[model samples]
Target: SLTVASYNLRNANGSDSARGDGWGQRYPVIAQMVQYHDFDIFGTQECFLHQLKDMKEALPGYDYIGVGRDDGKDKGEHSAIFYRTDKFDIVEKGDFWLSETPDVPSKGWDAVLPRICSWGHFKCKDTGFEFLFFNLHMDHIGKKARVESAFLVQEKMKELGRGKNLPAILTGDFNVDQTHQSYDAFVSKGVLCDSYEKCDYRYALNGTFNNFDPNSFTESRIDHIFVSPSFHVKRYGVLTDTYRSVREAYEARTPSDHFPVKVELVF
Candidate 1:
């Protein structure tokens, strides 16, 4: 069995840093949530270089794989994959921009900004089971770009896992709900299944995006965890813990605009 999670950190700028929701105030909450859950592996979107550094310091015993979307280096936000160092050994890893010319860092189709996916091949130290993991952030502005990105991901999975029956897991903030056409592009072939839909046990069925409001939340979920048919999902959940600091009197604040989605899978 292995545990995985997907989180959108909500980048440290604009409204995310307004009022009491600054990175300094919320990073502790985010770090605490991650540590408390203790997922074997996790993927995060909208993680800037500074934010990634902060997470590296806050969460010990974990290492990450990813590159900034802008320049194939640490230039902008990253969709990074973090794995417990003690639990898994990384065999290989790489990153590619989500575009027609994926080998280079550039925007694709009608995308407003360069998006990227970070992938890794890992071997479980305990079970010796190997698998391919991909963490991505798709274009939020372009519908065409999102659909193409979904197909690109499927193609990449086939290429990466070729000749190997190792289960593949894809997790990220897809920026589209399950009802969207992009969602069908992933599951239509019957190769991948949504972890939430396949899980036997689930918690927090309301939604994955909270926008910092615990009282009101919609049922639309843009964040997801997808697994190959080789694995069976045992449990799934949208973590809605409202952590309050000692300085707060009332209304515990959420860690980000999006909630972290988690799943436990058995192979």
Candidate 2:
């Protein structure tokens, strides 16, 4: 069995200082959650350079893959995957945008901002099981881009999975709910299984964003963890309160705007 999680570590600039004062105060709360969960694989979005470095330093046993979406030419947010070095050997890594030429640089879409997806291949040391993991953050402003990006990712997965039954796991902040066309594109592809839906035919129950505001009801279920059918899901859920304990470290704010979503998989 393997444990995986997704967290949107809202930028590292201490923007939510109103709640906890700054990143210095809220990061420990997030780190504490990481320490306690000890998840095997983690996917994160909305991360800046400093945040990723801090996580790498705080979590000593893991190694991460992928770089900034903007080709590192300029400062921009990015998505990343952190995997346990002792459990898996990272074979290869790649990334792309949410546009027509997703395989290239950042692509802007209508109704959404620019988006990028990161991918990594790993061979499990214990069972020799090899699989592909894709993590992404879709554009929040472009509706068409979101749908197009979803289909593009599906096509990319097909291309990557050729001649290999390597189970695939896709996770990220999709910015759409089950009823939306963007989410439907992925389901129609038939290559990935929504772990949350597979478990209960419903989305994870917890509200994933605006952790500090009680009036901030969930607008849509954006975060997800989708695994190929070849992998059986043992357990899956959203992680919310783990950071509440160390809230003081990050002032009163949490690690990111979105909470971490976790899934346990059995090969």
Candidate 3:
């Protein structure tokens, strides 16, 4: 069994605080979460240089791929994938945007801002099982962008998985829920299954955003881990606020404005 998690770090201490939740200030809590989960692979979005640096310094066991999505100019945010170096042999890596020319890193029609998805191929050292993993962050405020992004992801996955028999796992903060159109596009048409929905324990609710509102429930299943049918999910869960005991850090505010969504798979 291998554990993977999707975490949106909320732009974590970038100069762009207008859209940030100030979660990066609570480094201790973030560090605690990383230490507690001890995931084999972690996919993250909105991770800036400062947060990445801090994470690297604090969690020394993992190496990462993908840089900020600013065309290597260092202005925009990044969608990143981190994996334990000692446990998995990396086979390939690449990234693309949510646009017509997804091969390039540019914004597209209806896309308010540029978005990126990072993919990596890895073979488990212990089991020798190979898999393709992807991490992405969709445009939070654009409906068209979200819809088109879903289609773009499907295209990229199809291209990458051409002749490979390996299972694929995609994790990210989609900014949409189970019933949304974008969600439908991926699961219904893209041939990906949400691990949470396929598990024996159905009808379970896992909210992954806006920690300030505990009593209110809208369509907020935004963060997801969708796996191909080739792999079986042994356990799937949303590691919400209740799981973390560190109350000193933004117990009032939202931690990253989103909690980590984890999926454990038996391939």
Candidate 4:
């Protein structure tokens, strides 16, 4: 069994003053929450190079894979995957844009920004289990891009994972709830199943997005962990860990706008 998670780091921007503070304050809260939760591997969305560096400094014995979306270098957001070095040995990892020209860094369809998917093949040291992990952040503003991106990922996964017989996991911030056609693209044919809906033990707190307000709550979940049939989901949760520093001292002052969705998977 393995513990996996998907979290949107909520990239630092002046607009984030909308949260009353900036990334300078939020990153530490997210970093500590990640350690306390203790995931074997976790996928992150909307993170910048410095933000990753901040977490890397706070966390030891952890390595990650992913590239910036803008230049395939240190230019923009990264949908990175971080893993415990002691728990898993990296086999191979790569990055591809979610555009027609996946070979290079480019924006596709109606997307406002270039999007990339970070994927890797890892082998667990303890169980000898080999698997594929895919982490992405879908185009939040592009209707066609979201659905098209979903379909593209399906083919890419099949192409790379075809004869391997290894289990696969996709963790992401889809920016759409369960009923959206973009979300339906993956699950409609049963290629991927939402772990949140399949888990034996489930926990949800105001869905997966909080808008940085302690009183704000919603039932919609844009964050998801989807797994292949090779894995059995045991439990799922949406973490609401908040920062209660003297700065504000509120219960819902969350680490990020998006709560990290976690799951226990048995292969």
Higher-ranked by TM-score: 1 or 2: 1
Cα error, candidate 3, residue 115 (Å): 0.5
The best candidate by TM-score is 1
Q: Number of clashing residue pairs in every model?
A: 0, 13, 0, 0
User: Candidate 2: deviation at residue 182, Å?
Assistant: 0.6
TM-score of each: 0.96, 0.88, 0.86, 0.95
- What's model 2's TM-score? 0.88
> Candidate 2, after superposition: displacement of residue 227 in Å?
1.1
Which regions of candidate 4 are displaced past 4 Å?
Answer: 17-19, 247-252
Residue lDDT tens for model 3, 130-163: 8889899888678888888888887777788547
TM-score of 3: 0.86
Q: List RMSD in Å for every model shown.
A: 1.6, 3.1, 3.4, 1.7
Question: How much is 258 displaced in model 4, in angstroms?
Answer: 0.9
Task: Output the worst ten-in-a-row residue range by lDDT, candidate 2.
Answer: 242-251
Better of 2 and 3 by TM-score: 2
* Residue ranges of candidate 1 with Cα displaced over 4 Å: 245-248
Q: What is the C-alpha lDDT of each candidate?
A: 0.87, 0.75, 0.76, 0.86
lDDT of 4 by residue, 205-233 (tens): 66988777766788888899999876889
lDDT of 3: 0.76
